[PDB]
Design a protein around this ligand. Structure first.
Ligand code: SF4
Ligand code: SF4
Ligand code: SF4
Ligand code: SF4
Ligand code: SF4
Ligand code: SF4
Ligand code: SF4
Ligand SMILES: [Cl-]
Ligand SMILES: [K+]
Ligand SMILES: [K+]
Lengths: 174, 759, 760, 174
């Protein structure tokens, strides 16, 4: 049983597949131009350390909401870009958008530490509009993102220690 | 001829389509299919995932545009039907009346003049205006039938058109009630009334009104004045009827916004509940019955299976309700409804003494102890994902703070309780834990002032267009907030302190009034109610939003001497290029909120919404990187000029207060800002970005055309940053920028999107 | 003046609520939530599964009722806005026209008089009718906003109110065009016209019209008549614009119903396609471009992103279109649009000559061979689950009949092609395999007659209310059929052969015309067009459905001598208790179809729909076992009488033709039937049940009150069955029923559901 | 991957569970008053033999559509009742309905040989409105009935042999 964080978020027939941490990490690793997208929930439970560890593997970070403050506070802002989740979605689905370095779009988008119902709609946008060239959107967050291509199952906040073991396995697999 | 008839009198679907394309060529439609299917016809259910076409030929994006068109049509119908209903009642109960907005206003109905070309003189002159709206509603609804429009873009234009009709329907409804009931007509010192869960005097008979139509509440107040009962009965409201009622009587009170409705009703403070239409809990009969409060339904939009006793004597209705053989009644005669409610609340007040509605201490203890701290039940059903289970266990262990914190984050929807097998009344358990804070919820709000005065337009016009007043900030909309009701208060506070013109309506205006600063004052107590920089103004209820449109139109007519008669496109283009403004519906929820945003967007005003706003599926987002999307004409000679993204977006959803506030400032930039005005706006944008995000925006130099545009205090450091971090050619010695800016500053640059305005 | 003003002039939501509860107390709403969620506001998405309440407090059942209300509002708005647009232009282009419906009709608009109390004399007198509907539409749309009605029953009532407004909106539209364009006014000998995919002369320039609004096609015909081009250009339509065009000119033809639209467009027979509004393929621009056919859009409901060239000269528009610089244009001036279409189709005919659109033999062979016979791809996307893969493999092995058989079962939706990785154009492959049958689809249909003549009402009124004319059968609705277009043919043929009054509209009327009997006659060729027993009547387009309601009303006023002015409840109750009738929308699909059914139901007539009709979510079903639900007053003395389930249901979905035909007969029973009428109706129900189901209904005796009710030919075995199989007390020797019937028989039973009609 | 016969028939979050033929059989066995519901598709593939085998175990049959013709021609009409699928749904969810024998409602409804999209809506009516007393509705048909409580996965028509093998196992288990 896969439980979407909002039980009514049954969008349609193509539902996110449950993936191991190692498979989610290898998808980021296999991507030519991946993008880590983080939201306001990255500012909690020492989650920004994982984002920074991912970024330091050479992966740009889209810091949405007010997540940029935690990167500034943490002392890691290189290759981290402030942007709204909304405009980010519109830009990722736009084949003419040359990205944050001006070199091109992103083939893989991975979400982490985002407000569920907005992040989900950000994923549904890419799933339904970023089709050619195909952009793969995955979730390494604590939620079962039915709108992602691949995702973890729901991990309750009182089991956050379990989520951190799984996320750490994602980082080691990149 | 007060004015020459403009080109778009009583416009149909295609009459303003070219203006919509100007908007949409820049702010292109963006789609997030919350539902990837369509259920509207028996050929379905169609899967549209990935851009597929339905069984009727309609592709995914066009279905999303159809969906938002339906939403706007529902919202547009709600406002239009509200006004029609009020007008018909008024013309029959009180008669026709001359539209007199006072000597401080010459243009009685700017939007009516702008869209229909009509200069109304009496209330009865709004009948042809409503006739127009209602005819258009049916035309566009026809367009949403299977096998109609196939272009997503043309459907967005139909939604924009419906949004414009909504702004007209809002103006009619409010002008009508302002004139018919002598509500304030732009009063800068309008009275203050008590607001909040805790401002009600429970020792007096308490009558609760819920909805948007104030006509039955006028009869309540009128009956109370005639019988000398204004000091003996406590009359308070939830949602916009509360705003419109306090506009009629400064003796009434406001309980609060939609998020508070279920909790107040569940509290059982109300001896009688009188509802009308819109934003009423659909289970209000259940909830009233549970607290032994009779329900009086006064509008045919919402009967709840009750008997229509419009023709029965007030005596016989009271007997029935007092005796309990019916839990409520329908009374479509507002005069009779008012009499019944007032006579009934005095009787029920005595009969309801001795009842207990919220859990006792022991019951509360049993509830939190029996909770199983389920991993994914109540939290999954909750729209905000609140930690109810963990909060319950903390209370079982003797810590009720976690539960109490949830009261304000909760939006009173009741979904959590329905997935709880333990049958815990979660909504009432949070309330009990927060009872102390609920009872201390005692705020102060200025009454709905309605229209902006002509003298105020003349005072702020130039500083607003030039930019030295950094913008109109309009905090409006519903209370489906992501993180409680204090966010809208913090936005209003931050912008008024920075001398923006801060106006509010509906639930937003309510929620901003619940908080007090270090000196113990609500925003409405600390700041003046003038339409001016550094002032806080409660424009009024959700229909009063149209006064914001009207203010921007009057700026174009009074300060810029533009004709408005049937001249929508020229005025909208004026507002988009010169009137710094930004709407904020942090908790946008309803269909009325979608049509409000559409009508505001069509006249050239951007709107930010909360993270739940993705659920509307469609947004209007700019691509600041696409040069050809930001070309405007210099009306002096017809040349094309690439302009900074100002405003960058038209309808955009933000996730957190800390992202939203810098965004709002950003969305107030306009291409016609002078050096001092841009400098004012840029000082706030840069300082707000540093305050809330901890870093200056990555692309802030886009808003720098000359050194004079730079904030004064850090000008020298900004010049160095422009040189060494952005590679601009800047002479630090001479403190002058040589190259880098997007365009040269030209005070005479006459920016317009309209070829017909080229001279 | 002309009649006393009844109690419900221009009713609002609550004015007829008590009548709705009379209907719903008997036929309670039934709900099947196709979607168990709600997406309408940002508190959602709300899960309502199992009867839960949404975040607004609205319970699941009330949301279903709210959903059908929205669907009804979309249908009602479609008909009302169609009428308003037509009126606006007729009054501007041609001018006001006095309403003259002929010497054989006194009541011009029964529905208008019934609901508003107005006696319209000129077309301009319909403006206040439209003003009332449009005001009501906005009132009820306000009701579907979040935080409004909480009772599902009151929502159904609101839906019923929208349905009534739809029946009025339909009537205003048809009479307006009938009058402005002098369409047939009840012509029993209305001309017959050609119909079918294979009835088009491909040798002539072919102009195809799609939609519902005829104003632009009137200008086409008038332009053709002015320049003597009626023999030179082939003008045909798809959906109701076709019916209204042939009502104006019997020199035009009809291609077919909604299901046929995509296949004809893809055939590329049309040189120019002129569309107006409603039921048009939303991808028509892409489809027209594919076949090199310019598209002319004439209505602001559907612009397709095309440039609005209403103010451009016809010369310049033609230049733009012939040049191909733009694939289509918007021309909202119908006079100009007609000129462009007629001038343009002549130029394009030559330009498009030689083009090929369907697969060649080699392309066909490649497609069927590459098919992977996927277990669950295209079959799963198909709303009819057609066995496309297997058919493909059969054709690859030399058997194309399986594919050819799919052509009529397919409803032309295009969903199958989009899940096929091999990119096989399945819709075109099926068409190709069936070319022979498609080319042979050549029917004949009588043009839309419009109203029923008061003379016809005088003839059938008494025998219809007595039951000796066993009922009005109204075969209407869209073509989302479960199993092809022949079902509605068999339905009409079966009931006309049994002397029912068989009327048809819209796609149903079209599809019933495609088949021929052993004598090569279509139903319209074989049977007369009078509104009489044993006749076939094409009432007209979907808006023409209002003439059926009008016929039932005229019975109440002409035969029963009841007042109709603003007297809806009384007439509806009369129709429900005495007028044997049943609607049938076997392929109901649209929102207009939902609003049509709602307005038919409220005036007291039951409607059967097909198995796709479950997807509307709501139905109105009776409980024949619940005695208290079937009490009717005897207006003579006020006593209460428990009646047989007649009609048993108000809105019901059947699964197959074989189930539907006996059910239609069953729903024509009425409590005021006399012995001879009940016998006629029961004879057909018993024989139809035995013919299609192979057994008599398990509860047939319920419709037997005395011996005079049983079919004559088998009265004795029926008597034996009643005794030996149903335990009835019967004296077989004397041929007498002693005990068993649900009630005694009385010719003067004054059946009514309304207390106000009780005399003592 | 469970494939609903109409890919778009994603009604909500409570999705029918794949069950073994033995489990479906035992649910009929355990029922106090089971009812077999058959539609027009029972008249094909010798599927009525399976329906008659079930009926002959003491279980009433609701013959919807025109399936009663097949039972007449087969010579088994005892405990078989002519009824419409729509009225049947309204009846089953009505707690006061006393069934075809007048003894009470049915606690278990099993569908077989039915037109997919109408039978699915029939099942969804029961799932959503027959809640107290709870009526359990299951599918032993060739379709994945997402609206059933328990169901088989999709068995294509060209694999009807396998479907019959499973349906026979249901009969064996009753
Ligand atoms: S979520 Fe909305 S659009 Fe989607 S199937 Fe349900 S009601 Fe229809
Ligand atoms: S309106 Fe179109 S997309 Fe929607 S269910 Fe009908 S055919 Fe499908
Ligand atoms: S009532 Fe409050 S706690 Fe419960 S689901 Fe709604 S928002 Fe969450
Ligand atoms: S569903 Fe009920 S028992 Fe479970 S965590 Fe929530 S309040 Fe506790
Ligand atoms: S309208 Fe009501 S049921 Fe629908 S999504 Fe909004 S809160 Fe939920
Ligand atoms: S076009 Fe025909 S075969 Fe294809 S999915 Fe539609 S009905 Fe089925
Ligand atoms: S999806 Fe394509 S390849 Fe597969 S069975 Fe259908 S037509 Fe053949
Ligand atoms: Cl009578
Ligand atoms: K949640
Ligand atoms: K299918």
């Amino acid at each position: 049983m896969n439980i979407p964080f909002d039980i009514g978020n049954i969008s349609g027939p193509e539902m996110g597949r449950i993936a191991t941490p190692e498979a989610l990490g290898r998808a980021i690793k296999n991507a030519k131009r991946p993008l880590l997208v983080v939201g306001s929930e990255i500012l909690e439970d020492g989650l920004i350390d994982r984002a920074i560890a991912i970024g330091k593997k050479g992966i740009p970070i889209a810091a949405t909401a007010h997540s940029i403050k935690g990167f500034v506070d943490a002392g890691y802002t290189d290759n981290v870009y402030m942007v709204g989740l909304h405009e980010l979605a519109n830009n990722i689905k736009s084949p003419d958008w040359m990205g944050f370095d001006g070199k091109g779009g992103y083939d893989l988008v991975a979400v982490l530490g985002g407000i569920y119902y907005s992040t989900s709609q950000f994923l549904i946008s890419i799933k339904n509009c970023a089709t050619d060239p195909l952009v793969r959107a995955i979730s390494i967050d604590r939620y079962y993102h039915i709108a992602a291509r691949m995702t973890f199952d729901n991990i309750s906040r009182k089991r956050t220690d379990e989520f951190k073991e799984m996320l750490d396995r994602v980082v080691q697999s990149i | 001829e007060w004015e020459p008839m403009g080109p778009t009198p009583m416009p149909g679907i295609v009459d303003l389509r070219d203006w919509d394309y100007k908007l949409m060529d820049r702010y292109k439609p963006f789609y997030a299919p919350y539902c990837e299917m369509c259920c509207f016809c028996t050929f379905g259910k169609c899967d549209l995932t990935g851009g597929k076409k339905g069984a009727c030929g309609l592709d995914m994006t066009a279905q999303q545009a159809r969906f938002v068109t339906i939403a706007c049509l529902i919202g547009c119908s709600a406002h239009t039907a509200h006004g029609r209903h009020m007008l018909n009642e008024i013309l029959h109960i009180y008669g026709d009346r001359e539209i007199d907005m006072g000597t401080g206003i010459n243009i009685e109905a700017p939007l009516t003049r702008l869209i229909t070309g009509i200069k109304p003189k009496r209330l009865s002159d709004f009948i042809p205006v409503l006739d127009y709206i209602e005819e258009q509603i049916a035309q566009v609804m026809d367009s949403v039938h299977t096998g109609q429009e196939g272009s997503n873009i043309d459907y967005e234009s139909k939604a924009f058109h419906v949004g414009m009709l909504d702004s007209l329907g809002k103006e009619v409804a409010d002008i009508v009630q302002i004139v018919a009931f002598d509500l304030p007509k732009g009063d800068p010192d309008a009275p203050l009334v008590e607001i909040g869960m805790g401002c009600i005097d429970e020792t007096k008979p308490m009558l609760l009104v819920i909805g948007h139509n104030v006509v039955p509440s006028v009869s309540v107040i009128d009956y109370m004045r005639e019988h000398d009962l204004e000091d003996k009965i406590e009359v308070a409201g939830i949602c916009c009827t509360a705003i419109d009622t306090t506009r009629y009587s400064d003796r009434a009170k406001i309980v609060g916004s939609i998020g508070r409705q279920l909790r107040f009703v569940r509290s059982g403070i109300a001896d009688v509940i009188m509802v009308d239409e819109q934003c009423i809990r659909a289970d209000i009969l259940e909830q009233a019955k549970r607290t032994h409060a009779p329900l009086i339904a006064t509008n045919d939009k919402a009967l709840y299976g009750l008997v229509d006793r419009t023709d029965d004597s007030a005596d016989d209705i009271i007997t029935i309700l007092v005796s309990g053989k019916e839990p409520g009644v329908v009374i479509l005669d507002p005069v009779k409804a008012g009499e019944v409610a007032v006579r009934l609340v005095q009787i029920m007040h005595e009969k309801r003494k001795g009842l207990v509605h919220l859990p006792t201490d022991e019951e509360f203890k049993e509830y939190v102890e029996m909770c199983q701290n389920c991993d994914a039940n109540c939290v999954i059903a909750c729209p905000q994902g609140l930690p109810i289970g963990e909060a319950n266990k903390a209370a079982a262990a003797g810590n009720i703070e976690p539960l109490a914190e949830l009261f304000d984050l909760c939006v009173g929807c009741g979904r959590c309780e329905q997935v709880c097998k333990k049958h815990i009344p979660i909504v009432d358990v949070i309330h009990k834990a927060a009872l102390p804070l609920v009872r201390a919820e005692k705020g102060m709000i200025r009454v709905g002032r309605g229209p902006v005065l002509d003298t105020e337009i003349r005072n702020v016009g130039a500083p607003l267009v030039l930019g030295t007043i950094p913008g109109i900030i309009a905090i409006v909309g519903c209370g489906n907030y992501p993180n409680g009701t204090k966010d809208v208060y913090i936005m209003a506070k931050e912008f008024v302190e920075r001398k923006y013109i801060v106006v509010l309506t509906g639930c937003g205006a309510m929620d901003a009034a619940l908080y007090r600063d270090e000196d113990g004052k609500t925003l409405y107590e600390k700041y003046p109610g003038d339409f001016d920089g550094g002032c806080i103004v409660n424009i009024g209820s959700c229909v009063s939003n149209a006064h914001i449109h009207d203010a921007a139109i009057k700026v174009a007519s009074i300060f810029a001497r533009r004709n408005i008669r049937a001249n929508y496109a020229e005025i909208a283009d004026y507002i988009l290029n010169r009137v710094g403004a930004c709407g904020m519906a942090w908790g946008a929820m309803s269909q009325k909120a979608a049509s409000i945003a559409s009508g505001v967007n069509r006249i050239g005003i951007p709107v930010v919404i909360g993270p739940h706003g993705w659920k509307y599926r469609r947004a209007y987002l700019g691509r600041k990187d696409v040069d050809r999307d930001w070309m405007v004409y210099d009306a002096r000679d017809g040349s094309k000029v690439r302009i900074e993204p100002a405003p960058e977006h038209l309808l955009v959803a933000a996730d957190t207060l800390e992202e939203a506030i810098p965004l709002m400032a950003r969305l107030c930039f306009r291409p016609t800002d002078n050096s001092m005005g841009r400098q004012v706006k840029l000082t706030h944008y840069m300082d707000l970005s540093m305050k809330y995000l901890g870093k200056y925006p990555d692309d802030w130099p886009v808003f720098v055309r000359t050194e004079a545009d730079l904030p004064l205090a850090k000008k020298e450091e900004y010049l160095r940053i422009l040189k060494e971090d952005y590679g601009w050619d800047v002479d630090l010695e001479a403190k002058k920028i040589i190259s880098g800016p997007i365009r040269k500053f030209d005070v005479s640059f006459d920016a317009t999107n309209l070829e017909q305005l080229i001279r």
